[PDB]
Amino acid sequence: DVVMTQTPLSLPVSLGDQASISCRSSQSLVHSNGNTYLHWYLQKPGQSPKLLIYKVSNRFSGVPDRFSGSGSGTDFTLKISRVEAEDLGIYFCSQNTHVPLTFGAGTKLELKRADAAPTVSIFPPSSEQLTSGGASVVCFLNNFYPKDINVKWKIDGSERQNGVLNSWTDQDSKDSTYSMSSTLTLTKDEYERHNSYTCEATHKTSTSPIVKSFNRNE
Protein backbone atom coordinates (compact mmCIF):
# COMPACT_ATOMS: atom_id res chain seq x y z
CA ASP A 1 0.00 0.00 0.00
CA VAL A 2 0.98 3.66 -0.38
CA VAL A 3 2.07 4.88 3.03
CA MET A 4 1.21 8.50 3.89
CA THR A 5 3.65 9.89 6.49
CA GLN A 6 2.14 12.88 8.18
CA THR A 7 4.12 15.22 10.44
CA PRO A 8 3.99 16.61 13.09
CA LEU A 9 1.50 14.43 14.99
CA SER A 10 0.76 17.28 17.46
CA LEU A 11 0.88 20.95 16.50
CA PRO A 12 0.33 23.51 19.31
CA VAL A 13 -0.21 27.02 17.93
CA SER A 14 -1.37 30.45 18.97
CA LEU A 15 -4.41 32.03 17.34
CA GLY A 16 -3.34 34.27 14.48
CA ASP A 17 -0.18 32.15 13.81
CA GLN A 18 0.50 30.09 10.70
CA ALA A 19 0.50 26.26 11.00
CA SER A 20 2.31 23.98 8.45
CA ILE A 21 1.46 20.26 8.08
CA SER A 22 3.53 17.88 5.95
CA CYS A 23 2.39 14.72 4.16
CA ARG A 24 4.98 12.52 2.36
CA SER A 25 3.89 9.51 0.26
CA SER A 26 5.92 6.29 -0.26
CA GLN A 27 5.48 6.66 -4.05
CA SER A 28 4.41 9.40 -6.45
CA LEU A 29 0.77 10.42 -6.32
CA VAL A 30 0.74 11.51 -9.98
CA HIS A 31 -1.92 9.37 -11.69
CA SER A 32 -1.46 8.13 -15.31
CA ASN A 33 -4.17 10.72 -16.29
CA GLY A 34 -1.82 13.53 -15.07
CA ASN A 35 -3.81 14.46 -11.95
CA THR A 36 -2.51 14.21 -8.35
CA TYR A 37 -5.21 12.87 -6.02
CA LEU A 38 -3.95 14.22 -2.72
CA HIS A 39 -6.56 15.78 -0.44
CA TRP A 40 -6.65 17.43 2.99
CA TYR A 41 -9.42 17.07 5.57
CA LEU A 42 -10.29 18.51 8.98
CA GLN A 43 -12.09 16.31 11.58
CA LYS A 44 -13.44 17.54 14.96
CA PRO A 45 -14.39 15.29 17.96
CA GLY A 46 -17.70 13.47 17.45
CA GLN A 47 -17.87 14.91 13.92
CA SER A 48 -17.06 13.51 10.53
CA PRO A 49 -14.21 14.72 8.29
CA LYS A 50 -14.75 17.79 6.10
CA LEU A 51 -12.88 18.22 2.81
CA LEU A 52 -10.62 21.29 2.74
CA ILE A 53 -8.33 20.91 -0.29
CA TYR A 54 -8.62 18.53 -3.23
CA LYS A 55 -5.95 17.59 -5.80
CA VAL A 56 -3.11 19.25 -3.82
CA SER A 57 -4.10 22.90 -4.05
CA ASN A 58 -7.80 23.35 -4.90
CA ARG A 59 -9.97 24.74 -2.12
CA PHE A 60 -13.30 22.98 -1.73
CA SER A 61 -16.57 24.98 -1.61
CA GLY A 62 -16.87 27.24 1.44
CA VAL A 63 -13.24 26.77 2.52
CA PRO A 64 -11.51 30.06 3.53
CA ASP A 65 -8.47 31.34 1.53
CA ARG A 66 -6.39 30.90 4.72
CA PHE A 67 -6.06 27.22 3.84
CA SER A 68 -3.57 26.51 1.09
CA GLY A 69 -2.08 23.35 -0.26
CA SER A 70 1.18 22.89 -2.12
CA GLY A 71 3.69 20.29 -3.20
CA SER A 72 4.01 17.63 -5.89
CA GLY A 73 4.94 14.00 -6.49
CA THR A 74 5.59 12.62 -2.98
CA ASP A 75 5.87 15.80 -0.86
CA PHE A 76 2.87 17.90 0.20
CA THR A 77 2.14 20.69 2.60
CA LEU A 78 -1.01 22.22 4.05
CA LYS A 79 -0.56 25.76 5.39
CA ILE A 80 -3.19 27.38 7.62
CA SER A 81 -2.76 31.14 7.89
CA ARG A 82 -4.16 33.26 10.71
CA VAL A 83 -5.40 30.24 12.75
CA GLU A 84 -8.79 30.72 14.41
CA ALA A 85 -10.40 28.67 17.19
CA GLU A 86 -12.75 26.96 14.68
CA ASP A 87 -9.66 25.51 12.89
CA LEU A 88 -8.60 23.44 15.90
CA GLY A 89 -9.06 19.70 15.32
CA ILE A 90 -7.33 16.84 13.50
CA TYR A 91 -6.07 17.38 9.95
CA PHE A 92 -5.26 14.47 7.71
CA CYS A 93 -4.13 13.87 4.16
CA SER A 94 -5.57 11.20 1.87
CA GLN A 95 -4.60 9.77 -1.47
CA ASN A 96 -6.84 8.17 -4.11
CA THR A 97 -4.38 7.88 -6.97
CA HIS A 98 -3.72 4.23 -5.90
CA VAL A 99 -5.93 1.42 -4.60
CA PRO A 100 -6.23 1.02 -1.66
CA LEU A 101 -6.93 4.63 -0.83
CA THR A 102 -4.78 5.54 2.22
CA PHE A 103 -4.58 8.26 4.86
CA GLY A 104 -2.06 10.01 6.99
CA ALA A 105 -2.20 9.42 10.75
CA GLY A 106 -3.42 12.94 11.46
CA THR A 107 -2.07 16.13 12.98
CA LYS A 108 -3.83 17.52 16.05
CA LEU A 109 -3.85 21.35 15.75
CA GLU A 110 -4.15 22.46 19.42
CA LEU A 111 -4.10 25.78 21.32
CA LYS A 112 -0.88 26.79 23.05
CA ARG A 113 -1.25 28.17 26.64
CA ALA A 114 0.96 28.68 29.72
CA ASP A 115 2.39 25.58 31.43
CA ALA A 116 0.21 24.23 34.26
CA ALA A 117 1.16 21.48 36.67
CA PRO A 118 -1.38 18.65 37.07
CA THR A 119 -3.51 18.53 40.28
CA VAL A 120 -2.90 14.89 41.40
CA SER A 121 -5.35 12.94 43.59
CA ILE A 122 -5.13 9.27 44.64
CA PHE A 123 -8.07 7.10 45.74
CA PRO A 124 -7.92 3.78 47.53
CA PRO A 125 -10.43 1.00 46.71
CA SER A 126 -13.95 1.75 47.88
CA SER A 127 -15.43 -0.37 50.67
CA GLU A 128 -18.11 -1.52 48.14
CA GLN A 129 -15.50 -2.79 45.65
CA LEU A 130 -13.56 -4.60 48.39
CA THR A 131 -16.81 -6.30 49.61
CA SER A 132 -17.35 -7.40 45.96
CA GLY A 133 -13.83 -8.93 46.00
CA GLY A 134 -11.99 -6.39 43.80
CA ALA A 135 -9.46 -3.58 44.36
CA SER A 136 -8.89 -0.64 42.03
CA VAL A 137 -6.65 2.31 42.90
CA VAL A 138 -7.48 5.51 40.93
CA CYS A 139 -5.32 8.53 40.25
CA PHE A 140 -6.64 11.73 38.62
CA LEU A 141 -4.14 14.15 37.11
CA ASN A 142 -6.21 17.22 36.27
CA ASN A 143 -5.91 20.49 34.41
CA PHE A 144 -2.27 20.32 33.15
CA TYR A 145 -0.41 21.74 30.13
CA PRO A 146 1.45 20.59 27.94
CA LYS A 147 -0.42 17.32 27.21
CA ASP A 148 2.73 15.10 27.51
CA ILE A 149 2.65 13.30 30.86
CA ASN A 150 3.82 10.01 32.29
CA VAL A 151 2.24 8.11 35.17
CA LYS A 152 4.12 5.46 37.11
CA TRP A 153 2.43 3.19 39.68
CA LYS A 154 4.41 1.77 42.60
CA ILE A 155 3.35 -0.92 45.10
CA ASP A 156 5.61 -1.03 48.22
CA GLY A 157 8.09 1.15 46.27
CA SER A 158 8.24 -1.27 43.28
CA GLU A 159 7.05 -0.24 39.78
CA ARG A 160 3.83 -1.91 38.55
CA GLN A 161 2.91 -1.82 34.82
CA ASN A 162 0.30 -4.64 34.38
CA GLY A 163 -3.37 -3.87 35.11
CA VAL A 164 -3.09 -0.13 34.44
CA LEU A 165 -5.98 1.54 32.48
CA ASN A 166 -5.41 5.12 31.29
CA SER A 167 -7.84 7.63 29.79
CA TRP A 168 -7.30 11.24 28.65
CA THR A 169 -9.63 14.20 28.04
CA ASP A 170 -9.52 16.41 24.97
CA GLN A 171 -8.17 19.90 25.43
CA ASP A 172 -10.63 21.96 27.55
CA SER A 173 -12.59 24.57 25.49
CA LYS A 174 -12.48 27.11 28.39
CA ASP A 175 -8.99 26.76 30.03
CA SER A 176 -7.07 24.81 27.26
CA THR A 177 -5.78 22.20 29.73
CA TYR A 178 -5.77 18.39 29.65
CA SER A 179 -6.79 15.85 32.29
CA MET A 180 -5.99 12.18 32.75
CA SER A 181 -7.34 9.23 34.75
CA SER A 182 -5.13 6.26 35.62
CA THR A 183 -6.60 3.14 37.31
CA LEU A 184 -4.45 0.32 38.72
CA THR A 185 -6.57 -2.85 39.04
CA LEU A 186 -5.36 -5.60 41.39
CA THR A 187 -7.05 -8.57 42.96
CA LYS A 188 -8.30 -7.94 46.51
CA ASP A 189 -5.77 -10.64 47.68
CA GLU A 190 -2.90 -8.64 46.06
CA TYR A 191 -4.22 -5.43 47.64
CA GLU A 192 -4.32 -7.20 51.03
CA ARG A 193 -0.58 -8.34 50.60
CA HIS A 194 0.96 -4.82 50.13
CA ASN A 195 0.90 -1.63 52.19
CA SER A 196 2.04 1.35 50.09
CA TYR A 197 0.33 2.52 46.87
CA THR A 198 1.81 5.39 44.84
CA CYS A 199 0.82 7.44 41.72
CA GLU A 200 3.89 9.35 40.33
CA ALA A 201 3.35 12.00 37.66
CA THR A 202 6.23 13.21 35.42
CA HIS A 203 5.47 16.46 33.59
CA LYS A 204 7.59 19.30 32.14
CA THR A 205 6.47 21.66 35.02
CA SER A 206 8.64 19.83 37.60
CA THR A 207 12.15 18.26 37.49
CA SER A 208 11.05 15.83 40.26
CA PRO A 209 7.79 13.81 39.86
CA ILE A 210 4.59 14.72 41.75
CA VAL A 211 4.07 11.80 44.18
CA LYS A 212 0.69 10.90 45.73
CA SER A 213 0.58 7.89 48.02
CA PHE A 214 -1.36 6.16 50.76
CA ASN A 215 -0.86 3.26 53.10
CA ARG A 216 -3.66 0.62 53.15
CA ASN A 217 -3.77 0.64 57.00
CA GLU A 218 -3.01 4.37 57.60
Binding site: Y37, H39, Y41, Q47, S48, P49, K50, L51, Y54, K55, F60, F92, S94, N96, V99, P100, L101, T102, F103, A105, G106, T119, S121, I122, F123, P124, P125, S126, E128, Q129, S132, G134, S136, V138, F140, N142, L165, N166, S167, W168, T169, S179, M180, S181, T183, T185, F214
Partner: protein
Protein backbone atom coordinates in the same frame (compact mmCIF):
# COMPACT_ATOMS: atom_id res chain seq x y z
CA UNK B 1 -28.20 20.03 0.34
CA UNK B 2 -26.01 16.90 0.23
CA UNK B 3 -26.76 14.65 3.24
CA UNK B 4 -25.68 11.05 4.03
CA UNK B 5 -26.84 8.83 6.90
CA UNK B 6 -25.32 5.46 7.77
CA UNK B 7 -27.29 2.75 9.53
CA UNK B 8 -26.19 -0.60 10.90
CA UNK B 9 -26.84 -3.26 13.57
CA UNK B 10 -25.08 -1.53 16.45
CA UNK B 11 -23.68 -4.75 17.97
CA UNK B 12 -22.71 -8.04 16.28
CA UNK B 13 -21.18 -11.29 17.44
CA UNK B 14 -17.88 -12.57 15.96
CA UNK B 15 -18.43 -14.60 12.72
CA UNK B 16 -21.67 -12.75 11.86
CA UNK B 17 -22.23 -10.65 8.71
CA UNK B 18 -22.26 -6.86 9.03
CA UNK B 19 -24.87 -5.19 6.78
CA UNK B 20 -24.51 -1.41 6.45
CA UNK B 21 -26.79 1.04 4.63
CA UNK B 22 -25.94 4.62 3.45
CA UNK B 23 -29.18 6.62 2.81
CA UNK B 24 -28.47 9.87 1.06
CA UNK B 25 -30.13 12.94 -0.47
CA UNK B 26 -29.06 15.94 -2.53
CA UNK B 27 -27.31 13.82 -5.19
CA UNK B 28 -28.09 10.82 -7.38
CA UNK B 29 -26.09 7.72 -8.25
CA UNK B 30 -27.64 7.99 -11.72
CA UNK B 31 -25.44 11.12 -12.27
CA UNK B 32 -22.42 10.55 -14.59
CA UNK B 33 -19.21 10.65 -12.53
CA UNK B 34 -21.01 10.11 -9.19
CA UNK B 35 -19.72 7.60 -6.64
CA UNK B 36 -19.83 6.67 -2.94
CA UNK B 37 -17.11 5.18 -0.72
CA UNK B 38 -17.19 3.41 2.66
CA UNK B 39 -14.43 4.19 5.19
CA UNK B 40 -14.03 3.05 8.80
CA UNK B 41 -12.30 4.55 11.86
CA UNK B 42 -11.72 2.46 14.98
CA UNK B 43 -11.74 4.78 18.06
CA UNK B 44 -8.48 6.78 18.17
CA UNK B 45 -6.94 4.83 15.22
CA UNK B 46 -6.32 5.55 11.53
CA UNK B 47 -8.97 5.71 8.83
CA UNK B 48 -9.24 2.63 6.66
CA UNK B 49 -10.90 2.82 3.23
CA UNK B 50 -13.09 -0.19 2.42
CA UNK B 51 -14.88 0.02 -0.89
CA UNK B 52 -16.19 2.34 -3.59
CA UNK B 53 -19.00 2.23 -6.15
CA UNK B 54 -19.52 4.45 -9.19
CA UNK B 55 -22.74 5.35 -11.09
CA UNK B 56 -21.77 2.81 -13.80
CA UNK B 57 -21.38 0.00 -11.19
CA UNK B 58 -17.57 -0.02 -11.36
CA UNK B 59 -16.61 -1.27 -7.87
CA UNK B 60 -13.28 -1.08 -6.01
CA UNK B 61 -12.24 -2.81 -2.84
CA UNK B 62 -9.48 -2.69 -0.22
CA UNK B 63 -7.33 -5.66 -1.46
CA UNK B 64 -6.67 -6.95 2.07
CA UNK B 65 -10.43 -7.20 2.89
CA UNK B 66 -11.81 -7.81 -0.70
CA UNK B 67 -12.91 -11.45 -0.07
CA UNK B 68 -15.07 -10.26 2.88
CA UNK B 69 -16.62 -7.17 1.23
CA UNK B 70 -19.52 -6.50 -1.13
CA UNK B 71 -20.62 -2.98 -2.10
CA UNK B 72 -23.88 -2.40 -3.99
CA UNK B 73 -26.51 0.26 -4.54
CA UNK B 74 -30.23 0.85 -4.99
CA UNK B 75 -30.08 3.89 -7.28
CA UNK B 76 -33.77 4.79 -7.26
CA UNK B 77 -33.92 4.49 -3.39
CA UNK B 78 -30.79 6.64 -2.98
CA UNK B 79 -29.00 3.93 -0.97
CA UNK B 80 -25.57 2.27 -0.97
CA UNK B 81 -24.84 -0.93 0.94
CA UNK B 82 -21.81 -2.65 2.35
CA UNK B 83 -21.73 -6.27 3.51
CA UNK B 84 -18.74 -7.49 5.59
CA UNK B 85 -18.70 -11.25 6.24
CA UNK B 86 -17.20 -13.19 9.18
CA UNK B 87 -16.71 -10.16 11.46
CA UNK B 88 -14.26 -10.15 14.39
CA UNK B 89 -13.28 -7.70 17.20
CA UNK B 90 -11.02 -5.72 14.76
CA UNK B 91 -14.14 -4.74 12.75
CA UNK B 92 -15.31 -2.63 15.73
CA UNK B 93 -15.28 0.93 14.36
CA UNK B 94 -17.30 3.92 13.28
CA UNK B 95 -18.36 3.28 9.61
CA UNK B 96 -18.77 6.27 7.28
CA UNK B 97 -20.14 6.63 3.80
CA UNK B 98 -18.90 9.56 1.73
CA UNK B 99 -20.06 11.11 -1.52
CA UNK B 100 -17.16 10.51 -3.90
CA UNK B 101 -17.59 11.75 -7.48
CA UNK B 102 -14.69 11.31 -9.95
CA UNK B 103 -13.06 14.71 -9.39
CA UNK B 104 -13.53 15.08 -5.66
CA UNK B 105 -13.31 11.83 -3.73
CA UNK B 106 -14.83 11.92 -0.24
CA UNK B 107 -16.26 15.39 -0.58
CA UNK B 108 -19.21 14.95 1.84
CA UNK B 109 -19.20 12.46 4.70
CA UNK B 110 -22.07 11.09 6.76
CA UNK B 111 -21.93 11.35 10.57
CA UNK B 112 -21.11 7.64 10.79
CA UNK B 113 -22.58 4.58 12.48
CA UNK B 114 -20.93 2.84 15.44
CA UNK B 115 -20.43 -0.94 15.07
CA UNK B 116 -19.21 -3.08 18.01
CA UNK B 117 -18.15 -6.69 17.36
CA UNK B 118 -18.12 -8.58 20.67
CA UNK B 119 -19.16 -11.88 22.31
CA UNK B 120 -19.73 -10.00 25.64
CA UNK B 121 -23.09 -10.21 27.36
CA UNK B 122 -25.06 -7.13 28.50
CA UNK B 123 -23.44 -6.26 31.84
CA UNK B 124 -24.53 -3.38 34.09
CA UNK B 125 -21.60 -1.39 35.56
CA UNK B 126 -20.38 -1.60 39.13
CA UNK B 127 -20.41 2.01 40.38
CA UNK B 128 -17.93 2.84 43.11
CA UNK B 129 -17.67 6.09 45.05
CA UNK B 130 -14.19 7.61 45.31
CA UNK B 131 -13.83 9.60 48.51
CA UNK B 132 -10.52 11.30 49.43
CA UNK B 133 -7.70 9.56 51.29
CA UNK B 134 -9.13 24.56 50.00
CA UNK B 135 -10.70 22.29 47.34
CA UNK B 136 -11.67 18.62 47.44
CA UNK B 137 -11.67 16.16 44.51
CA UNK B 138 -14.24 13.29 44.57
CA UNK B 139 -14.72 10.60 41.99
CA UNK B 140 -16.95 7.89 40.60
CA UNK B 141 -15.50 4.67 39.06
CA UNK B 142 -17.87 2.96 36.58
CA UNK B 143 -16.43 -0.48 36.07
CA UNK B 144 -17.05 -3.54 33.96
CA UNK B 145 -20.00 -2.72 31.73
CA UNK B 146 -21.12 -3.73 28.27
CA UNK B 147 -22.03 -2.26 25.85
CA UNK B 148 -21.39 1.46 25.60
CA UNK B 149 -22.71 4.00 26.53
CA UNK B 150 -23.40 5.06 30.10
CA UNK B 151 -24.56 8.55 31.14
CA UNK B 152 -22.93 10.01 34.21
CA UNK B 153 -24.04 13.13 36.09
CA UNK B 154 -23.39 14.63 39.51
CA UNK B 155 -26.29 15.73 41.73
CA UNK B 156 -28.79 14.94 38.90
CA UNK B 157 -26.96 17.36 36.58
CA UNK B 158 -27.01 20.33 39.01
CA UNK B 159 -23.28 19.88 39.65
CA UNK B 160 -21.53 20.43 36.25
CA UNK B 161 -18.67 22.86 36.93
CA UNK B 162 -15.31 21.32 37.88
CA UNK B 163 -16.31 17.90 36.42
CA UNK B 164 -14.01 15.65 34.27
CA UNK B 165 -15.72 12.59 32.83
CA UNK B 166 -13.13 10.44 31.10
CA UNK B 167 -13.54 8.32 27.94
CA UNK B 168 -14.21 4.59 28.53
CA UNK B 169 -11.40 2.01 28.11
CA UNK B 170 -11.81 -1.75 27.33
CA UNK B 171 -10.47 -4.45 29.72
CA UNK B 172 -11.23 -8.15 29.06
CA UNK B 173 -14.30 -7.34 26.85
CA UNK B 174 -15.81 -4.86 29.37
CA UNK B 175 -15.68 -1.05 29.54
CA UNK B 176 -14.55 1.11 32.47
CA UNK B 177 -14.77 4.87 32.86
CA UNK B 178 -14.29 7.37 35.66
CA UNK B 179 -15.36 10.91 36.55
CA UNK B 180 -13.86 13.43 38.93
CA UNK B 181 -15.59 16.45 40.53
CA UNK B 182 -13.79 19.27 42.36
CA UNK B 183 -15.72 21.43 44.85
CA UNK B 184 -14.66 23.76 47.69
CA UNK B 185 -14.10 22.10 51.14
CA UNK B 186 -17.04 24.22 52.54
CA UNK B 187 -19.33 22.39 49.99
CA UNK B 188 -18.47 18.71 50.85
CA UNK B 189 -19.13 16.71 53.07
CA UNK B 190 -21.53 19.36 54.51
CA UNK B 191 -23.65 19.05 51.31
CA UNK B 192 -24.61 15.77 49.56
CA UNK B 193 -22.69 14.79 46.37
CA UNK B 194 -23.94 11.78 44.41
CA UNK B 195 -22.84 10.41 41.07
CA UNK B 196 -25.78 9.22 38.94
CA UNK B 197 -25.03 6.46 36.42
CA UNK B 198 -27.47 5.17 33.84
CA UNK B 199 -26.77 2.21 31.51
CA UNK B 200 -29.80 2.07 29.14
CA UNK B 201 -28.73 -1.30 27.63
CA UNK B 202 -29.18 -3.09 31.01
CA UNK B 203 -32.10 -0.71 31.94
CA UNK B 204 -30.17 0.33 35.09
CA UNK B 205 -29.84 3.64 36.96
CA UNK B 206 -27.61 3.73 40.05
CA UNK B 207 -26.99 6.59 42.46
CA UNK B 208 -23.83 6.42 44.59
CA UNK B 209 -23.45 9.01 47.29
CA UNK B 210 -19.86 10.00 48.09
CA UNK B 211 -19.32 9.40 51.84
CA UNK B 212 -16.18 10.45 53.82
CA UNK B 213 -13.94 7.44 54.61
Amino acid sequence: QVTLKESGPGILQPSQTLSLTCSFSGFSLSTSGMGVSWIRQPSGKGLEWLAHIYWDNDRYYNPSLKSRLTISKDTFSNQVFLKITNVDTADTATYYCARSPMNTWGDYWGQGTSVTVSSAKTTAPSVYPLAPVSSVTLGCLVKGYFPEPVTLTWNSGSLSSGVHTFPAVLQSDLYTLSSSVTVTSSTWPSQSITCNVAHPASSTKVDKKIEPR
